[PDB]
Amino acid sequence: DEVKYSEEVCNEQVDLYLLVDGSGSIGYPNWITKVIPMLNGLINSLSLSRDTINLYMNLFGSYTTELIRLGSGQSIDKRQALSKVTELRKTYTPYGTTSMTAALDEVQKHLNDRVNREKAIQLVILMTDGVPNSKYRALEVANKLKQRNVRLAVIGIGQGINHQFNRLIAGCRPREPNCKFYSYADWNEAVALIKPFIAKVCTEVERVANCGPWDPWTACSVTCGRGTHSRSRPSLHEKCTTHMVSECEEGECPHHH
């Protein structure tokens, strides 16, 4: 049989994959005046913690660089993620081509290897000017991610943004105003874009677990008259009953004395 119990279910777990375009087309001046402030305001708005939002961060250009792994100290502690941004401001100058497909493939690899948290919202934030090394290859992997229930938000950065491609990879529809998947203003707009993707929702549900079969009833405690016997079973779940006692009779006892 089965056991029923109540529990509260929220969507507080979010695995957030921040993919940052560091290619030459972004440009150094844009890196400093636009990209770094965008990353700061974005990350400053995120409530990181072990049990809630976990940050992953990748820098893509000629190559890809995994900067922050899911679950690490820098992944779950806001101040530490911000220090990584500071390191990028001070020591990284954009150069090279744009390995956008490879960065998105890192997210695929997480899902494939089951590195993500099973119950977590999967959210990719892609910051780019929208000029990848291969247009179709980038669209293809983004599409595969969406098919696996990954949410994708695109933030436009860089001196020369291709809004057509950014909107395309974000899944914006032609003729529709206010695409909910693409922002190209400041960090405030980007934060407001991200908000509905990660808003907390708590509901009260009823849960069910299979307790498994019982072992056979034991013999009666007495060999005549009234007694008790029991049956047991392994605990296949915390809520499951494992022992059970009942009455039993073995005819009548003799009259003596």
Ligand X SMILES: *[C@@H]1O[C@@H](C)[C@@H](O)[C@@H](O[C@@H]2O[C@H](CO)[C@@H](O)[C@H](O)[C@H]2O)[C@@H]1O
Residues that bind Cl ion (CB under 5 A): 100-101, 132-134, 138
Note whether 83 and 118 are within 8 A (CB).
no
Cβ distance 16 to 190 under 8 Å?
no
Contact pick of 10, 47, 50, 66 for Na ion (by CB under 5 A): 66
Instruction: Select the residue whose beta carbon is closest to ligand X and give its number.
Output: 223
CB under 8 Å to 4, separation ≥6 — which residues? 206, 207, 208
User: Which residues ranging from 165 to 194 are in contact with Mg ion (CB under 5 A)?
Assistant: none
Question: Has 98 been labeled as part of a binding site?
Answer: yes
Tokens coding 120: 């977590």
Q: Which does 251 bind (CB under 5 to 8 A by kind): Cl ion, ligand X, Mg ion, none?
A: none
Give me the least distance between CB of 66 and Na ion, in Å please.
4
Annotated ligand binding at 221? The verdict is no
The string of DSSP letters for 147-191 reads HTT-EEEEEE-SSS--HHHHHHHHTPPTT-SS-TTEE-S-HHHHH
Distances (CA, A) of 23 to 16, 41, 159, 214: 21, 21, 11, 64
Minimum Å gap between C-beta 43 and Na ion is: 18
Choose among ligand X, Mg ion, Na ion, none what residue 25 binds, the Cβ cut-off being 5 to 8 Å by kind: Mg ion
90: Cβ contacts below 8 Å, ≥ 6 apart: none
CB of 232: closest distance to ligand X in angstroms? 23
Interacting residue with Na ion among 3, 24, 82, 106 (CB under 5 A): 106
User: Judged by CB, which is closer to Mg ion: 25, or 116?
Assistant: 25
What is the SS3 assignment for 84? Answer: helix
Q: Of these partners, ligand X, Mg ion, Na ion, none, which one is at the site of residue 224 (CB under 5 to 8 Å by kind)?
A: ligand X
Burial of 115 (0-12, 13-18, 19+ CB in 10 A): middle
Distance in Å, CB of 135 to Cl ion, minimum: 8
Q: Can residue 189 be called a binding residue for Na ion (CB under 5 A)?
A: no
Closer to ligand X by Cβ: residue 77 or 250: 250
Instruction: Give ∠ CA 90-96-98 in degrees, rounded to 5.
Output: 105
Q: Which residues are annotated as a binding site for Mg(2+)?
A: 23, 25, 98
Q: Which residues are annotated as a binding site for Mn(2+)?
A: 23, 25, 98
Binding region for Mg ion (CB under 5 A):
23, 25, 98, 131
